[PDB]
């Protein structure tokens, strides 16, 4: 039952984990793109055809913040995909920015901020995702007040929906079997279920990162 | 034996089954080395046509060639099967007629 | 409840044990008295022989 130790399996494991931390690729290498073939030279993978247009016309977040005093702290940044989709003001209020110093133009890095999606401001600041996307736009200072003007519409929404055919019949049968005599209709309380949009910013802290294998 | 003795000894240990000349295989291929005859044991008398072949496993064995008349020669390939020749002591292999170089016996 | 009943049963059996042991001693004492009487005679007769 005494298992024979495998030392090389543990040695290489530590060496691999270490090298993944010392030779890790930077955002400048990972998220570079050849604008003629529209492929990431790091991996040589083609971008999706639906992204080709914006990659050529739109700017990344730190292609904008690299031109500002403190990388645009306390400045509002929106996204074209948000402007086209939602009428309500959607933006990040930048709070922290870790620029990638290896970029020749300081056009890569990370960013933190406070999200305000569709006029609902989040209570706490969290890391911004899609910072490497060609989608961001900087809000001029003189346009900030008008841009952020929002009136909350009435939240009147459906509170209860009927059970499907079979489930309803099975709940009414249990009532009669137990003896309870009532004519009320069983209904599902969907007020607790808050359906958020599919393009709502996800948690960047839980998102992974590309591995080092370069092409 | 007593119940205590039977428990301490356990079930009978099946004697290992012995592999015959074919090593538990239906047939073996071989190369003819020499062809000769052997005289059977009592009370029989004949000149039974046998040959020595080198089996694919590397062992060389004497194999009886059945039928009336054979054309086997050295450096020929034959298929051998089990089955002892009851007359010839120690000949436990038989050449298959109609396979590789060994042809079917000619009618009458 | 079952454990209490078991202890009660053991107590009842113990009372029967004491009664049985008391009777056995009475018989033991009687047998002992007879053995001692026989032994005393043997020793006396044997002591006289050596004297």
């Amino acid at each position: 039952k005494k298992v024979r130790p495998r030392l090389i399996a543990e040695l290489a494991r530590r060496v691999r984990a270490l090298r993944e931390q010392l030779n890790r690729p930077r955002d400048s290498q990972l998220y570079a793109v050849d604008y003629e073939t529209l492929t990431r030279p790091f991996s040589g993978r083609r971008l999706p055809v639906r992204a080709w247009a914006d990659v050529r016309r739109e700017s990344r977040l730190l292609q904008l913040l690299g031109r500002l005093p403190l990388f645009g702290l306390g400045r509002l940044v929106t996204r074209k995909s948000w402007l086209w989709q939602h009428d309500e003001p959607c933006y990040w209020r930048l709070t922290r920015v870790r620029p990638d110093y290896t970029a020749q133009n300081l056009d890569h890095g990370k960013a933190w901020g406070i999200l305000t999606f569709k006029g609902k401001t989040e209570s706490e600041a969290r890391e911004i995702e899609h910072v490497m996307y060609h989608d961001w736009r900087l809000v001029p200072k003189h346009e900030e007040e008008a841009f952020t003007a929002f009136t909350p519409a009435p939240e009147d929404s459906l509170a209860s929906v009927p059970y499907p055919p079979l489930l309803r019949a099975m709940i009414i049968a249990e009532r009669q079997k137990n003896g309870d005599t009532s004519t009320e209709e069983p209904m599902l309380n969907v007020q607790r279920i808050r359906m958020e949009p599919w393009d709502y910013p996800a948690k960047q802290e839980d998102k992974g990162r590309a591995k080092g294998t370069p092409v | 034996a007593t119940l205590n003795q039977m428990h301490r000894l356990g079930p009978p240990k099946r004697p290992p089954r012995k592999l015959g000349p074919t090593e538990g295989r239906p047939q073996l291929k071989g190369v003819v080395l020499c062809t000769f005859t052997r005289k059977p044991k009592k009370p029989n008398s004949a000149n039974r046509k046998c040959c020595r072949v080198r089996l694919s496993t590397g062992r060389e064995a004497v194999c009886f060639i059945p039928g009336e008349g054979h054309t086997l020669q050295e450096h020929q390939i034959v298929l051998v099967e089990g089955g002892r020749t009851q007359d010839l002591p120690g000949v436990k292999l038989t050449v298959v007629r109609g396979k590789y170089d060994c042809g079917h016996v000619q009618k009458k | 409840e079952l454990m209490a009943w078991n202890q009660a049963e053991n107590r009842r059996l113990h009372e029967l044990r004491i009664a049985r042991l008391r009777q056995e001693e009475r018989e033991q004492e009687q047998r002992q008295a007879l053995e001692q009487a026989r032994k005393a005679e043997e020793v006396q007769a044997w002591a006289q022989r050596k004297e």
Binding site: - | N4, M6, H7 | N10, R17, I18, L21, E25
Partner: protein, 110 residues
């Protein structure tokens, strides 16, 4: 209360007391022979922590499983000495007995 040791309560015979504060106990269980369908004793050795070193070779002991093994082989502790070797007290009457004879008659204390 939860313990990771498989055997929670086991009675055994003390077979060795040469380790410090550790009594070596032989525990026997009845195992069915599948062919003969007769029960034969199967014995296993258990190390039991004895803090007071009050265990003697040949005495019957009760071992309680420790919450976690204190040593590589010590997974139990001496819970109680059921029968002391040569100094047995009859549980039924509570009187000292040598074999099948009472050293003190149960009728002494009524």
């Amino acid at each position: 209360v939860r313990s990771s040791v498989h055997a929670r309560w086991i009675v055994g015979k003390v077979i060795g007391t040469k380790m410090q504060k550790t009594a070596k106990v032989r525990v026997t269980r009845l195992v069915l022979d599948p062919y003969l369908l007769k029960y034969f004793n199967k014995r296993k050795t258990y190390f039991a922590h004895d803090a007071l070193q009050q265990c003697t070779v040949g005495d019957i002991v009760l071992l309680r499983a420790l919450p976690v093994p204190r040593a590589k082989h010590v997974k139990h502790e001496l819970a109680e000495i059921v029968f002391k070797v040569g100094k047995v007290i009859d549980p039924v009457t509570g009187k000292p007995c040598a074999g099948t004879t009472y050293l003190e008659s149960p009728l002494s204390s009524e």
